[PDB]
């Protein structure tokens, strides 16, 4: 069974460095070229580099030259991408790939991909504030200006489940995330029932609570 397995990837800062790996099995690298291909979120595929592990001959795309280095290792059956001088626009899912063999220059096998995020934003827990409600009403919590993903939002410590809708985060031009969570509740519960949103941002080791009250 031909397989390609990638490892490494993650958040890094511009200027910084990361190393990806592509462990082959089910065939011998040496018999073919190994490639790296990458996919910026919401975009197409862009070839990045290539190596013939029999001799180490490399090729690169212009946008990466002098920045990235593809390499291989016979013994361990493994290709690497060393990525330096990283920029925001190297953010992508990075796939490794091979040609078939002989004159078969389509990519028949791909690894599962690994995500690399390049951002200058610094780790930061969110500023949370309650979204006051004006049958039913709508109330919520605005989770503002955190980095990186993710956050988890519960209501009344996980006890309040009906009417709960937590929305996907927007990534703002600033490079920070914001999101909202709303609950639909009985209008007759307002001013009486306690509603608390509990916000947990593990990357900054931060939990925040906020009580939501009518006005």
């Amino acid at each position: 069974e031909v397989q390609l397995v990638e490892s490494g990837g993650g958040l890094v800062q511009p200027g910084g460095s990361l190393r990806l790996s592509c462990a082959a099995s089910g065939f011998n690298i040496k018999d073919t070229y190994i490639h790296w291909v990458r996919q910026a979120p919401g975009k197409g595929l862009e070839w990045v580099a290539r190596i013939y592990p029999t001799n180490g001959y490399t090729r690169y795309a212009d946008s990466v030259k002098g920045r990235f280095t593809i390499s291989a290792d016979t013994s361990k059956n493994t290709a690497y991408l060393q990525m330096n001088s990283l920029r925001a626009e190297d953010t992508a899912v990075y796939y490794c790939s091979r040609w078939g063999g002989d004159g078969f220059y389509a990519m028949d096998y791909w690894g599962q991909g690994t995500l690399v995020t390049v951002s200058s934003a610094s780790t930061k827990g969110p500023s949370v504030c309650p979204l006051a409600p004006s049958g039913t009403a709508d109330l919520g919590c605005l989770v503002k200006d955190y980095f990186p993903e993710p956050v988890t939002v519960s209501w009344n410590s996980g006890a309040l489940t009906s009417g709960v809708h937590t929305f996907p985060a927007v990534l703002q031009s600033s490079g920070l995330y914001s999101l909202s969570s709303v609950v639909t509740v009985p209008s007759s519960s307002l001013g009486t029932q306690t509603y608390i949103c509990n916000v947990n941002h593990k990357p900054s080791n931060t939990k925040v609570d906020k009580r939501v009250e009518p006005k």
């Binding site: 197409g44 070839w47 389509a106 990519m107 028949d108 791909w110 309650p130 503002k144 929305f167 927007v170």
Partner: protein, 211 residues
């Protein structure tokens, strides 16, 4: 550097449609062209190599052909597992290049109109000299939505940040739009408005500093 121009960028099809996708190469590439399929969060899978050779295990309702620098993928009768994104690629020269992709989408069941929920600023932000209007858009299908913001009744383009629609677990869509303001700005107007238009229906919601 050889460019692959793929058309169309998107298509909604019915199961059983004959679907054709086209790639124009910017210069001659012979027959050194592959097609790939990709599903969300997965790796591309090879469909067709050397322009017209069907890869092993790919159903035969798939085929590819060439006229000049025009390359074409045909699916004779669309099946559900075919809904996906398709990419062509030339492998004639280095570097190999891809089309921008064609998204083949389900022509969805009856539409659903969005709930729009528009909130004014928090105190906590006002006291820190910030302000955010929050427009939450849920339970709509298909997942294409036009968001317009207005102050009094004048269009506002500045400081809009809107998410791309994402599928809820109920298979309808949600999205969020945030208008960033200063308190000054907020108080300067009588009302602000979040306008959502979806499949020919407009849902407007407004909020006012004076309560």
């Amino acid at each position: 550097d050889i460019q692959m121009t793929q058309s169309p960028s998107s298509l909604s099809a019915s199961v059983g449609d004959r679907v054709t996708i086209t790639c124009r190469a910017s210069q001659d590439v012979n027959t050194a062209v592959a097609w790939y399929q990709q599903k969300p969060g997965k790796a591309p899978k090879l469909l067709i190599y050397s322009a017209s050779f069907l890869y092993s295990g790919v159903p035969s309702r798939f085929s590819g052909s060439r006229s000049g620098t025009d390359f074409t993928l045909t699916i004779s009768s669309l099946q559900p597992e075919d809904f996906a994104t398709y990419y062509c690629q030339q492998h004639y020269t280095t570097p190999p290049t891809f089309g921008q992709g064609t998204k083949v989408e389900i022509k969805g069941q009856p539409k659903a109109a969005p709930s729009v929920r528009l909130f004014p600023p928090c105190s906590e932000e006002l006291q820190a000299n910030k302000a955010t209007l929050v427009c939450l858009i849920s339970d709509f299908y298909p997942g294409a939505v036009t968001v317009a913001w207005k102050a009094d009744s004048s269009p506002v383009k500045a400081g809009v940040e809107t998410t791309t629609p994402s599928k809820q677990s109920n298979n309808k869509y949600a999205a969020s739009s945030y208008l960033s303001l200063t308190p000054e700005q907020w108080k300067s107007h009588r009302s602000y408005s979040c306008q959502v238009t979806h499949e020919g229906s407009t849902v407007e919601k407004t909020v006012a500093p004076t309560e």
